[PDB]
Design a protein around this ligand. Structure first.
Ligand code: CLA
Ligand code: CLA
Ligand code: CLA
Ligand code: CLA
Ligand code: CLA
Ligand code: CLA
Ligand code: CLA
Ligand code: CLA
Ligand code: CLA
Ligand SMILES: CCCCCCCCCCCCCCCC(=O)OC[C@H](COP(=O)(O)OC[C@@H](O)CO)OC(=O)CCCCCCCCCCCCCCC
Lengths: 100, 740, 159, 144, 93, 80, 41
């Protein structure tokens, strides 16, 4: 027997003598009030598979980034059609020879 | 029963073994056949555990070797005092400390090195010293070169005494073991005798020579008219003229009326405003209190009479619930092994050196020290580096104790055992905190760099943008600046000017001004913490995984120094504790380089400079708070801006630095061949050249072999540290000797 | 002296863990039992939405306060919330591909509790359970970040 | 000498519990189990760290990899002069015997061994790697 | 060895360890010296605690002569309790 | 698994066996040398390739070789 | 005295003595004949 006077390594009882314990894992039901099971399992019915939510993230990622291109014009700090409102360094190019 | 136990004539005195190289060990003795044997002759010379296996003989060896070390130190000090006496301008410096720069070395007029003799002022020519012996000598009261010469002769005599002492105690009267194993008597005698009576004697010397002579020198009379110190010992009435307490003699001391000694044992705080150093009355009072403290502490242990403590009882009484048996068994460890002692003593010794450096820039003790910028920088840097090396040595010898002298039979359930038994938790968490500090402390600089290059300086961490204020250090700064009014009612000032307050200017330059702490200080401090933790990780990992690990279950039987365990199980290069010491050396270099860069730039930007009676104009204009958050800031404003003097020193009296600069680079880059490559390639190349000698019948009858792996690594790190540190030395000295 | 606190795990000094008042103190043990990641009797979807609601609501903050749109008023909240929703999206993708890589083969053999009895295996550790958990995470995280915006807009002395 | 099996009710040496014990190579793949009979109680050194006390009589341990059992075997054999034996245990109840697996530790030659992986030529009588080229996989010329 | 299961009482709660801790440290912590002008190290920052409790949401100044009182007060309060708990001499002294 | 091969210049001095930290070498009877022994490698699936057998061999260019090959979970020495 | 002479016959001592000799010789030549660049003579 394993749990005895220093009699370790019980051969037929491998799940003690090995180090396979659930440290903090309780198991009981009724953690939640009942109808969230209804409201959330009837809500995640669509994307409950491997390909489904993986398609959803593709759809949303595309439909977010591609529209970020042409309606992320909320100043983006500089580039998006706010541009150089001064002729910045056109003729300033070189130090000894100007070169434009 | 502690007593003297000495043996008579153990080892006779003859030159016989000097003609037999490698006589000490059984392996080395048979003579060379390869060139590995030369490096083995030099590698195992001081490995006193690898000649014999007896404690007594090792102890006698280390005792006499200590005497040798002391002797060489005395020869060095004697040289310094002699060179001060004969080849310097010390008296011309005493006549006018400002505008006359300290010089104590003169070169010979040969191929052109005579341009190194600089115009140091005072009708003298030579090389400016930054070692700062002149301020030390003025602090002791030395006014003439004759006294320096006498001190030189005395030093040489003491050196001969030390070498004779070493010879005597190894060959004629060599102590037994149980002389050494009386650690309690050694503690009593060191604490009382050495530290305490040294403090008391030096207090005597200050009170009777250094206080009055410096009082006259700072009063303005030239040094020749000042009375000689034996006139100060013999004639009481002169001391009564200077400090009237001496007219009452030693009556106040023996009747506990100490309040009448308030003329030469003071407690005033800041600095000497006419000098720039500490008040010497404080210094004398300090050594008196130190001596009383240590002389009290030295009567703690039991030697021959019933009173006092035993070390074993003290150790065995301390054991708690979380640590099993506690300290039971550390006394047997710390009286039977020398490497454990070397580990502890090197640790505390090096840390002590670094504290010396910090206090020595913060509160300048010597007269006219704070306005000689080069001396300040050199002293802080030097003690910093020595501290670093000593701490790495502590790591190495703790590892050696783990490998060789550790016996688990005498050490069963114990603090050492439990540390070994959860090394995995220890090293894992130390690894975590290293990575955390890494990301934050260095990513702040990368982020500031990126933001400052992308056109938006408003999204970087700085004093005007997003701010990171060291609120803790500022609060402590104000606490100590306010201390003389609530929590130190009897001091007249703070212990230093870096805590805040006014400015002390000596001869136009700034002695010390309050230091402010901003965002750049926050970031560099966390850089320091990061590198320190990484070095701790490497060294402590070496100590804990020195005997065995999950990778190698028998790493103890391979010894302390070994290269690998083959390419198997993936590859096991560098698993000895020795290689942990090796990588620790690299990281020590890194951390201390950052520390001394921080000190140099912070001082040149916020403390030093001239008082031009128009405010303060610092040397670099005060750009530390705005530039020390970008790596570009360091690379431009520090390395690129401050190298203009070391690169343009050719033709002046400063070109030695601008010429040793490049050599330091060369050695640094030369180390890389030893670090990167491996010995098989060199073995084959050396074999081909051996063929080219076999053709012409110049085959060496000793065999050329390439260096062993460990030696190649060691030589690599030697050249690496030499080149890097020499570069920093040249740069610092050229810069601050040029503009300071 | 006949008093000790620190013990090896369930006797057995030869498993590489040892018990400490950090790991096996009673209040810590009951606390980490009551967290949603250790309950084993509930369906993984619901755990997914609980964990997601928590993590989205906390992830919204730093983008709001420290993002590049943090000084322009009334729109500093929008950009932060949107970016946080993006991060939650990427976390959902990571959960999905982890499910595709980890549980792709046979499971382990056996499991017992600490005060030994043969407890069954957690259904979160199969392909279906993990995929359902990922879907729950997406729903919960997006709901949480949306709630972060809502909570910003109507809250007494938010600043 | 026949191949012996172990008796899994032997006590274990006294030890406090290290970090460095069994990880999950034991839960899924394998773990090794060592056995010896002592004569007097004594303190030995674990090949993970720390010190343990062996019991007067039979003992029993368990380890992760094989070099740990060989390290403890060499230490118990050259220092204390005992006769240990360590097994391999699979995580479903399968026990394999090894070391010595011949009765006699593999230095004293025991008649009745079959030599394997044993080429019968001088080391410099190998073929060039051009003549073993284009085979099923990477081959060293001294593997043929 | 060390043990076989973690004891779920390791802090052996003796109920008069804490009451003697802060009660036997604060009754001599409010004496009155020459050093402060007739004030205590428990009443002089009672003034402070109430003083910057008055203007509530403003976190008090980062140099305000009472952080010293907080830190030096707890530096002794924690010490006297942690040496009180080793007043479990039930088996040791 | 690695490849360990014993060659015929072996003199059977048992150094390789005492150096192996994994017990993959053993001495078999042989009739080719003075000691009437020869090493053999019956268990090269336990070898990790540390090459202590090569270091312990006295005869020049060695009578035992360890050719490195495809690693496994036992030939990497992984304990986790 | 024989063993002292043999100690003086070791490699680094003779290296020190001989390199002192060579160095001093070159140094004296560079003192008495300052700044040589070409031979022409
Ligand atoms: C330990 C510190 C130290 C250092 C770094 C120096 C350094 C220097 N001293 Mg100096 N000195 C010292 C201590 C020191 N001294 C002491 C303690 C004294 C008092 C005795 C002096 C007295 C002194 C004088 C009087 C002079 C110097 C001079 C010099 C400079 C030129 C030296 C020279 O040309 O050597 C010359 C080279 C040699 C003598 C070569 C000797 C090498 C032999 C052959 C090696 C043989 C090996 C052997 C086994 C080991 C030696 C054993 C020993 C007993 C001989 C140089 C900067 C000169 C100077 O400053 O001029 C401006 C000078 O005139 N020194
Ligand atoms: C008051 C007595 C006294 C004093 C002053 C010292 C002082 C010292 N001991 Mg020491 N020691 C003492 C008693 C004392 N010990 C006793 C009682 C024991 C036996 C238990 C030892 C055993 C011991 C060992 C085993 C070692 C020392 C070492 C040292 C030196 C440490 C190096 C250092 O920093 O010195 C700073 C340098 C100085 C202070 C220079 C001053 C030196 C002069 C000679 C003063 C020495 C006073 C001398 C001991 C009195 C006897 C002189 C003799 C002629 C009878 C230091 C000189 C270590 C050492 O360096 O060995 C050489 C060392 O290894 N001691
Ligand atoms: C440890 C260092 C030290 C030393 C060496 C001295 C030494 C001295 N102090 Mg002094 N002092 C010290 C620390 C020290 N002090 C400290 C720390 C303080 C602050 C509290 C003072 C405060 C102080 C005051 C206020 C005064 C002195 C004075 C003196 C001098 C006279 C002492 C006296 O009146 O008779 C004390 C008597 C003795 C010490 C006995 C000496 C016995 C001799 C040496 C024995 C020789 C016998 C031998 C067989 C002779 C050989 C014969 C043959 C071979 C020829 C004396 C030179 C007085 C003085 O002269 O002022 C200038 C004085 O007024 N000191
Ligand atoms: C109080 C200081 C102290 C003492 C007494 C010792 C003593 C010892 N150490 Mg140790 N150590 C120390 C500090 C110290 N160390 C520090 C600070 C470090 C960190 C760098 C180390 C790192 C260290 C390692 C890594 C090892 C030792 C070892 C040893 C032992 C053998 C030493 C030997 O044979 O050297 C022989 C002498 C030399 C090799 C001299 C060469 C040193 C360098 C190359 C010269 C320095 C260059 C110089 C500064 C500039 C060059 C000038 C010019 C030529 C250009 C011996 C017990 C070894 C051991 O195994 O212990 C048993 C070992 O492996 N130590
Ligand atoms: C500049 C070169 C350099 C760098 C960056 C590092 C970095 C590191 N070394 Mg190291 N090392 C170096 C040179 C360097 N070393 C050299 C030359 C030696 C020889 C002596 C060593 C020897 C050495 C040892 C012996 C050890 C380390 C350790 C470490 C780690 C410390 C933890 C840390 O700060 O990570 C944080 C990472 C950084 C600070 C790097 C910058 C990260 C940036 C700022 C942010 C990253 C985000 C990134 C941009 C996102 C990617 C986007 C992209 C995919 C598109 C770290 C990985 C120690 C370790 O691992 O333990 C903790 C350790 O034990 N090193
Ligand atoms: C500073 C960097 C540096 C330097 C100087 C060298 C120099 C050399 N390398 Mg290279 N190497 C380097 C970096 C460097 N390497 C790096 C980073 C790597 C990558 C790992 C390599 C990889 C490498 C390989 C793989 C090979 C070389 C080879 C060579 C040699 C080429 C022959 C030659 O130029 O002779 C000139 C030699 C010198 C300039 C050496 C300096 C000698 C000094 C000037 C004399 C000493 C002065 C004085 C007496 C010292 C007093 C100090 C006292 C304390 C002793 C030469 C020794 C090859 C070789 O050996 O071919 C024959 C070769 O096979 N190296
Ligand atoms: C070429 C590659 C690339 C591109 C195009 C970008 C683009 C961007 N980066 Mg970026 N980055 C990159 C590589 C890249 N990065 C890499 C390699 C690194 C690591 C070194 C970073 C690290 C980095 C940081 C640290 C930050 C950015 C930020 C940004 C944004 C700045 C624009 C702005 O002013 O904020 C305006 C921002 C917005 C208007 C928010 C838009 C949020 C996304 C795009 C919309 C999501 C839509 C929604 C979630 C979909 C709904 C799903 C549904 C299920 C509900 C912009 C989207 C900033 C950012 O966005 O964080 C706040 C920022 O702080 N980057
Ligand atoms: C009841 C808990 C509580 C609450 C709601 C706040 C709330 C706040 N604190 Mg505050 N604070 C607290 C406890 C609390 N603090 C405690 C215990 C301390 C340490 C004594 C501080 C120290 C502190 C400082 C130092 C500062 C704040 C500041 C602030 C404001 C941001 C905000 C109103 C900041 C502020 O607005 O003050 C100017 C600020 O600078 N707090
Ligand atoms: C490897 C390249 C190299 C070469 C070719 C030279 C060559 C020369 N150097 Mg030079 N030098 C070098 C490297 C080199 N050095 C290095 C690396 C350094 C730095 C340490 C120096 C530092 C240096 C200095 C500081 C000086 C020289 C000087 C000289 C000249 C003096 C010649 C001499 O000794 O008198 C002639 C000597 C003899 C004829 C005696 C030889 C005895 C034999 C028997 C002659 C046989 C003839 C038949 C000569 C042109 C000196 C000079 O005036 O520059 C022009 C000088 O002042 N050099
Ligand atoms: C906090 C430390 C609490 C330490 C503490 O409270 O120890 C108290 C506890 C008391 O032990 P005992 O009194 O039973 O031990 C008796 C004898 O062994 C020594 O008296 O010491 C330990 O159990 C060691 C546990 C290590 C704890 C590791 C914590 C590591 C933290 C490192 C980071 C520090 C950051 C700040 C650095 C300035």
């Amino acid at each position: 027997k394993y749990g005895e006077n220093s009699r370790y390594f019980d051969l037929q009882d491998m799940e003690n003598t090995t180090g396979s314990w659930d440290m903090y894992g309780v198991d009981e039901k009724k953690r939640y009030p009942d109808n969230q099971a209804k409201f959330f399992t009837q809500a995640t019915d669509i994307i409950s598979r491997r390909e489904s939510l993986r398609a959803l993230v593709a759809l949303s990622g595309i439909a977010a980034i591609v529209t970020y291109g042409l309606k992320g014009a909320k100043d983006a700090d500089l580039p998006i059609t706010k541009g150089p409102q001064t002729t910045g360094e056109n003729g300033k190019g070189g130090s000894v020879r100007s070169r434009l | 029963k502690v007593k003297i136990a000495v043996d008579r004539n153990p080892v006779e005195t003859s030159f016989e073994k000097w003609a037999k190289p490698g006589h000490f060990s059984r392996t080395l003795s048979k003579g060379p056949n390869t060139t590995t044997w030369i490096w083995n002759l030099h590698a195992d010379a001081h490995d006193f555990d690898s000649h014999t296996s007896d404690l007594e003989e090792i102890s006698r060896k280390v005792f006499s070797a200590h005497f040798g070390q002391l002797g060489i130190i005395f020869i060095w000090l004697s040289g310094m005092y002699f060179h001060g006496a004969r080849f310097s301008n010390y008296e011309a410096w005493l006549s006018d400390p400002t505008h006359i720069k300290p010089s104590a070395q003169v070169v010979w007029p040969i191929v052109g090195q005579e341009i190194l003799n600089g115009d140091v002022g005072g009708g003298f020519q030579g090389i400016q010293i930054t070692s700062g012996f002149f301020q030390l000598w003025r602090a002791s009261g030395i006014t003439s070169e004759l006294q320096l010469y006498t001190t030189a002769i005395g030093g040489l005599v003491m050196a001969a005494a030390m070498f004779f002492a070493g010879w005597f105690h190894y060959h004629k009267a060599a102590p037994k073991l149980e002389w050494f194993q009386n650690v309690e008597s050694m503690l009593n005698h060191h604490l009382g005798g050495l530290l305490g009576l040294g403090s008391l004697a030096w207090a005597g010397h200050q009170i009777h020579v250094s206080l009055p002579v410096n009082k006259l020198l700072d009063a303005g009379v030239d040094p020749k008219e000042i009375p000689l110190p034996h006139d100060l010992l013999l004639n009481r009435a002169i001391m009564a003229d200077l400090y009237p307490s001496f007219a009452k003699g030693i009556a106040p001391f023996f009747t506990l009326n100490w309040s009448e000694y308030s003329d030469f044992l003071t407690f005033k705080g800041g600095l000497n405003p006419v000098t720039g150093g500490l008040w010497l009355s404080d210094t004398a009072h300090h050594h008196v209190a130190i001596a009383v403290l240590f002389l009290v502490a030295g009567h703690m242990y039991r030697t021959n009479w019933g009173i006092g403590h035993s070390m074993k009882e003290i150790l065995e009484a301390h054991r708690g619930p979380f640590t099993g048996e506690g300290h039971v068994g550390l006394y047997e460890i710390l009286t039977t092994s020398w490497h454990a002692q070397l580990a502890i003593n090197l640790a505390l010794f090096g840390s002590l050196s670094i504290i010396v450096a910090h206090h020595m820039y913060a509160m300048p003790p010597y007269p006219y020290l704070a306005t000689d910028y080069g001396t300040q920088l050199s002293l802080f840097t030097h003690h910093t580096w020595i501290g670093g090396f000593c701490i790495v040595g502590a790591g190495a010898h703790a590892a050696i104790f783990m490998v060789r002298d550790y016996d688990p039979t005498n050490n069963y359930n114990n603090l050492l055992d439990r540390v070994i038994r959860h090394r995995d938790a220890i090293i894992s968490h130390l690894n975590w905190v290293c990575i955390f500090l890494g990301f934050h402390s260095f990513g702040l600089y990368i982020h500031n760099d990126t933001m400052s290059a992308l056109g938006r300086p408003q999204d970087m961490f700085s004093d005007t943008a997003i701010q990171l204020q060291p609120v803790f250090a500022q609060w402590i700064q104000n606490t100590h600046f306010l201390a003389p009014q609530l929590t130190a009612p009897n001091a007249l000032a703070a212990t230093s000017l870096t805590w805040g307050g006014d400015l002390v200017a000596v001869g136009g330059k700034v002695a010390m001004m309050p230091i402010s702490l901003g965002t750049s200080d926050f970031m560099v401090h966390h850089i320091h913490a990061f590198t320190i933790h990484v070095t701790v990780l490497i060294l402590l990992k070496g100590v804990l995984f020195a005997r065995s690990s999950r990778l190698i279950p028998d790493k103890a039987n391979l010894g302390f120094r070994f290269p690998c365990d083959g390419p198997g199980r993936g590859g096991t290069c560098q698993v000895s504790a020795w290689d942990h010491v090796f990588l620790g050396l690299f990281w020590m270099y890194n951390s201390l380089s950052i520390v001394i860069f921080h000190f140099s730039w912070k001082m040149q930007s916020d403390v030093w400079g001239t008082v031009t009676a128009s405010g303060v104009s610092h040397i670099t204009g005060g750009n530390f708070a705005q530039s020390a958050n970008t790596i570009n800031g360091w690379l431009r404003d520090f390395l690129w801006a401050q190298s203009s003097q070391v690169i343009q020193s050719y033709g002046s009296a400063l070109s030695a630095y601008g010429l040793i600069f490049l050599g330091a680079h060369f050695v640094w880059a030369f180390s890389l061949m030893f670090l990167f490559s491996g010995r098989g390639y060199w073995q084959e190349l050396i074999e081909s050249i051996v063929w080219a000698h076999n053709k012409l019948k110049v085959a060496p009858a000793i065999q050329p072999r390439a260096l062993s792996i460990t030696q190649g690594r060691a030589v690599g790190v030697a050249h690496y540290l030499l080149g890097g540190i020499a570069t920093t030395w040249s740069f610092f000295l050229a810069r601050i000797i040029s503009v300071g | 002296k006949k008093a000790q606190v620190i013990s090896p795990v369930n006797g057995d000094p030869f498993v590489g863990m040892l018990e400490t008042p950090v790991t096996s103190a009673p209040i810590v043990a009951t606390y980490l039992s009551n967290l949603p990641a250790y309950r084993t009797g509930v369906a993984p979807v619901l755990r997914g939405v609980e964990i997601g609601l928590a993590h989205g609501f906390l992830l919204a903050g730093p983008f709001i306060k420290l993002g590049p749109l943090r000084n322009v008023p009334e729109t500093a909240e929008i950009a932060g919330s949107l970016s946080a929703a993006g991060l939650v999206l990427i976390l959902a993708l990571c959960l999905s591909i982890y499910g595709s890589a980890q549980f792709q083969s046979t499971p382990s053999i056996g499991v017992k509790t600490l005060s030994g009895r043969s407890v069954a295996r957690d259904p979160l550790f199969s392909a279906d359970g993990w995929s359902e958990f990922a879907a729950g995470f997406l729903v919960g995280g997006e709901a949480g970040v949306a709630w972060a915006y809502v909570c910003t807009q109507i809250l007494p002395y938010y600043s | 000498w026949t191949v012996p099996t172990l008796n899994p009710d032997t006590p274990s040496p006294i030890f406090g519990g290290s970090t460095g014990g069994l990880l999950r190579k034991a839960q899924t793949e394998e773990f090794y189990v060592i056995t010896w009979e002592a004569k007097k109680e004594q303190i030995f050194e674990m090949p993970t760290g720390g010190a343990a006390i062996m019991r007067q009589g039979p003992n029993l341990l368990k380890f992760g990899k094989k070099e740990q059992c060989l390290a403890l075997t060499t230490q118990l054999r050259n220092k204390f002069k005992l006769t240990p034996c360590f097994y391999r245990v699979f995580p479903d109840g399968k026990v394999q015997y090894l070391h010595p697996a011949d009765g006699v530790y593999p230095e004293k030659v025991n008649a009745g061994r079959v030599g394997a992986n044993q080429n019968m030529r001088r080391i410099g009588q190998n073929v060039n790697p051009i003549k073993v080229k284009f085979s099923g996989r990477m081959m060293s010329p001294a593997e043929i | 060895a060390s043990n076989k299961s973690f004891p779920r009482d390791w802090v052996k709660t003796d109920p008069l360890v804490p009451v003697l801790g802060f009660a036997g440290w604060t009754i001599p912590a409010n004496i009155g010296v020459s050093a402060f002008g007739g004030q205590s190290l428990f009443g002089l920052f009672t003034q402070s605690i109430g003083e910057n409790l008055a203007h509530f949401p403003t976190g008090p100044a980062l140099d305000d002569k009472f952080w010293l009182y907080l830190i030096t007060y707890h530096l002794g309060l924690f010490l006297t309790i942690t040496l009180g708990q080793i007043g479990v001499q039930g088996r040791k002294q | 698994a690695h490849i360990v091969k014993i060659y015929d210049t072996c003199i059977g001095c048992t150094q390789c066996v005492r150096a192996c930290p994994l017990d993959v070498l053993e001495m078999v009877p042989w009739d080719g040398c003075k000691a009437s022994q020869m090493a053999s490698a019956p268990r090269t699936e336990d070898c990790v390739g540390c090459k202590r057998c090569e270091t312990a061999c006295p005869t020049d260019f060695l009578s035992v070789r360890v050719y490195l090959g495809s690693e496994s979970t036992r030939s990497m020495g992984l304990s986790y | 005295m024989k063993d002292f002479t043999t100690y003086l016959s070791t490699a680094p001592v003779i290296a020190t003595i001989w390199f002192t000799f060579t160095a001093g010789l070159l140094i004296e030549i560079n003192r008495y004949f300052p700044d040589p660049l070409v031979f022409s003579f």
